Design a protein around this ligand. Structure first.
Ligand code: DKA
Length: 13
């Protein structure tokens, strides 16, 4: 996906 913590459309990672 891409993210890490706060924020997104599900989290975590
Ligand atoms: C989230 O990004 C997990 C999937 C791995 C990245 C795929 C992006 C396109 C690959 C060329």
């Amino acid at each position: 996906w891409x993210d890490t913590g706060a924020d997104x459309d599900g989290x975590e990672w």
